[PDB]
Write a protein that binds this ligand. Sequence first.
Ligand SMILES: CCCc1c(OCCCOc2ccc(OCC(=O)O)cc2)ccc(C(C)=O)c1O
Ligand SMILES: CCCc1c(OCCCOc2ccc(OCC(=O)O)cc2)ccc(C(C)=O)c1O
Lengths: 254, 254
Amino acid sequence: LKAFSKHIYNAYLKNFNMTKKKARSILTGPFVIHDIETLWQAEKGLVWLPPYKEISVHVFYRCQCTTVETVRELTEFAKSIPSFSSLFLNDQVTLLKYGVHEAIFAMLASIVNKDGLLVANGSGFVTREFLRSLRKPFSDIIEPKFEFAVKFNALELDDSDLALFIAAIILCGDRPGLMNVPRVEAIQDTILRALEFHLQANHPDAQQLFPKLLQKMADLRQLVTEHAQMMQRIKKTETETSLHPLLQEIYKDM
Amino acid sequence: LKAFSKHIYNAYLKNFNMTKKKARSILTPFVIHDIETLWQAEKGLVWLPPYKEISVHVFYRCQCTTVETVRELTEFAKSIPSFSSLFLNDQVTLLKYGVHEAIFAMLASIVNKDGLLVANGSGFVTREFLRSLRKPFSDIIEPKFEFAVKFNALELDDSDLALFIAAIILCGDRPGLMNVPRVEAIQDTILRALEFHLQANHPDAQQLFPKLLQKMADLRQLVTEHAQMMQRIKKTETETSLHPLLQEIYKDMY
Ligand SMILES: CCCc1c(OCCCOc2ccc(OCC(=O)O)cc2)ccc(C(C)=O)c1O
Ligand SMILES: CCCc1c(OCCCOc2ccc(OCC(=O)O)cc2)ccc(C(C)=O)c1O
């Protein structure tokens, strides 16, 4: 269990290009993108796909590049978890399908602060204000991740906690159309039971931390649901803006 | 390209326990041709739902072998050069619609005019006995023999088969494929690989390549017939269970 927990931690450290440790250090605990000018400045070099069109739509496409890229890292992370690799690829896909966004928003907390978040592997900092100035459609689907992040960061988890927490979110028996539910619920339980002992060791004086995170997991489920509805409104009202094919397959039935 | 072949041949040699050139040795095995011999193999030849009847029990043996071959193929495909780069969801699509095609192809390696090997060649079930099975199960089996016999006439070895098999999995025509161009390109290389490989390994033979491409189409018609028959069995043959995985593959075939 303590060994299983370390194993999950190593899979996390090996598969993610950005850990919270780094994130918090960079954010002192990076080019500031706060308007059209600075974002253009960032796109050229200081920092850094479909043809342009407008600021709000261009930032949405960056969210997509980022999320798809994180989905690739979550796939390798899960695959680096022996039990998960045992399931038939179909169940592996079902789990990733319904869990990556929940996992992405939990991890977004690592690179977020009351004022904004980092982008392009820590090189840039996009202000929450700027993101707020965007067109209503896009500005409102972004804001809630912040509200959840700030609150999430107050629990002060480290990469070791997050590794277990993220594995738990992915290995969930609830997901639509899962084939081997028992097997899955069993892997999660083992994960949760290891998180249980890990927190007691890592955060000795934090009371109620564990049941607090289970609630955070339920919270993430509601955050994604609302994210998905907003994603549906964008596919319906934003005729000119596209959506990466991989993201159309996830929101296919969500 | 010479390496590519050689690299797919090894992935085939370590992922598949039973190879044609091995099934050929132990065939130049306990003979199972009736209920008593099957009984003793099930006791002796230590290779499932409670014993129903002989016809159904043999049907369950097919599923068992079929489900385990899917396990192998999954690992094999994952060894194929660019296969693993494809997003999991496409990997699942390719496996879903290709595994039976692959399976019925490899089946030829262990097939005879008079029967086939089972449980790592320790057993051999006669074709006549399978033909003696109750009305529905006997009819879905026989056609694999008819196809296998003609296929063995091409006298291919394990090196050829490895490319032929990878070529069947990497098919850009499968319904619901996300990155079609990507798959089509990986398939082309496999084919050109198969192309040159056949030149060195079977210089004498004429029209072998066009022959094989036609075999791939035949295999496509074989599974369609197979899936229909399976659908009928899942309908009229109530009380006969179907492995959940096999249920996921067939659910969307017509
Ligand atoms: C995970 C995306 C992280 C992110 C931003 O997050 C905002 C909070 C998250 O907001 C969204 C997340 C995803 C999204 O759509 C894609 C999807 O839902 O899969 C839309 C909004 C905002 C800007 C950038 C830039 C400039 O590079 C960025 O990389
Ligand atoms: C590939 C299965 C190979 C096989 C047999 O093949 C008959 C030709 C293939 O026939 C079928 C293949 C699969 C099948 O259903 C399962 C599926 O469609 O996936 C039904 C018939 C017959 C008997 C056995 C035993 C006694 O162990 C066996 O392992």
